[PDB]
Amino acid sequence: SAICRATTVEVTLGKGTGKMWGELCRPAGSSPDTVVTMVHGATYNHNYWDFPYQPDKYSFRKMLNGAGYATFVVDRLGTGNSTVPPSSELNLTVEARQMHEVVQGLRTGRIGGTGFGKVVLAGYALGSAVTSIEASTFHDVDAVLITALGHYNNPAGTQAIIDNGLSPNDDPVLKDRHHYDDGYATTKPGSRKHVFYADRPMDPGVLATDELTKDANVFTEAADPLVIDPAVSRAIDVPVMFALGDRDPLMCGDGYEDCSSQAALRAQEAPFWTSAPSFDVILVEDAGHGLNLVPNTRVYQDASRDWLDRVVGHGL
Ligand SMILES: COC(=O)c1nc(-c2ccc3c(n2)C(=O)C(N)=C(OC)C3=O)c(N)c(-c2cccc(OC)c2O)c1C
């Protein structure tokens, strides 16, 4: 009981133009004023935000639709059903302009027909960096949901990704789709378990589904200084939820992102969100880096939902 229409969006790409794939979903028998736009992270695609194994439990999109909200999960360019351009043409700032265009199109009704009054941007990992830049540059979103991306980080976590990297032309899952140039990457088979999820308890079906729905990415975007720039996040003048897993191998550690308690995390990040009228923080126990895909994810889902209800509402 949820209406879902897949569509493509004409999006800026140097000269112009390229195709961004996205799915718009509305709760059955309902027409909400609020849409939540969901930008996935690196090496993932839209499936992260609409996960297809036990969706009742792990699909964040679905949870949102059940809460009354409209949702727009996208395939970032380079991934899934979207255009896969030359890696040189793509970077975070370019990608944020693309997201601005998706927002723009959801507000006016170009995307979806009805046209939404409130737009929420939701971000996972480097999608949160895309989200932040969009929010900072254009100021055309009513609230921002930041996940799996902190201002401090762990070099060794990042290095493990580099030590488990390979080219998507050598990867059995991604071989057949495209001929990717030398600036696209993905992760090795069997590596995600450790490099993202930290070896924490997971459903075996979740790990298998993750490796079967994984994607490529443009790996220069990870080294971008904009990912951790304080100037970007400090400029955000709307309500922000900041979500992080307490065993995230890319952030957490002594002398890095303080994942010892929620209050400590809150303390350490607050100097980076000073224009936000409200700054809320959830810290997900025994969780790695993919928050939607952990066994106690529902704690994270309920909090996110309750926040939305509090800072935007789903309209009428
Ligand atoms: C799913 O998580 C990510 O989007 C992600 N991927 C990665 C990631 C993913 C794939 C790759 C790489 N990094 C990478 O560095 C590299 N050389 C590759 O080539 C093999 C990758 O495929 C990240 N490094 C980072 C990252 C983490 C902390 C701080 C950062 O910058 C200040 C980050 O960019 C993130 C957040």
Residue numbers in the entry: 61 to 376
Authors' account:
StnA is an essential enzyme in the Streptonigrin biosynthesis pathway. The crystal structure shows that StnA has an α-helical cap domain positioned atop a common α/β hydrolase domain. The data clearly shows that Ser185-Asp308-His349 constitutes the catalytic triad of StnA.
The S185A complex structure was determined in a different space group P1 with the resolution of 2.90 Å by molecular replacement, using SeMet-StnA as a search model, with 7 molecules in the asymmetric unit. The electron density for the substrate at the binding pocket is clear in every molecule of the asymmetric unit. Substrate 4 (PDB 3-letter-code is STM) perfectly binds into this narrow pocket. Among the four hydrogen bonds, two hydrogen bonds are between the substrate and the main chain amide nitrogen of Ala102 and Leu186 (2.7 Å and 3.1 Å respectively) and play key roles in forming the oxyanion hole. Two additional hydrogen bonds are between the main-chain carbonyl group of Ala282 and the hydroxyl group of ring D, and between the side-chain amide group of Asn277 and the carbonyl group of ring A. Furthermore, there is also a possible π-π stacking interaction between ring A and Phe279. The hydrophobic nature of the binding sites and the aromatic nature of the substrate suggest that the substrate recognition could be predominantly controlled by the shape-complementarity between the substrate and the binding pocket, i.e. hydrophobic interactions. The surface view shows that the binding interaction between STM and StnA is mainly contributed by the cap domain residues. The His349 Nδ1 atom forms a hydrogen bond/salt bridge with Oδ1 (3.2 Å) and Oδ2 (2.7 Å) of Asp308, located between strand β7 and helix αE. The alignment between native and S185A mutant complex was shown in Supplementary Fig. S3. The figure suggests that the catalytic triad is relative stable with small change.
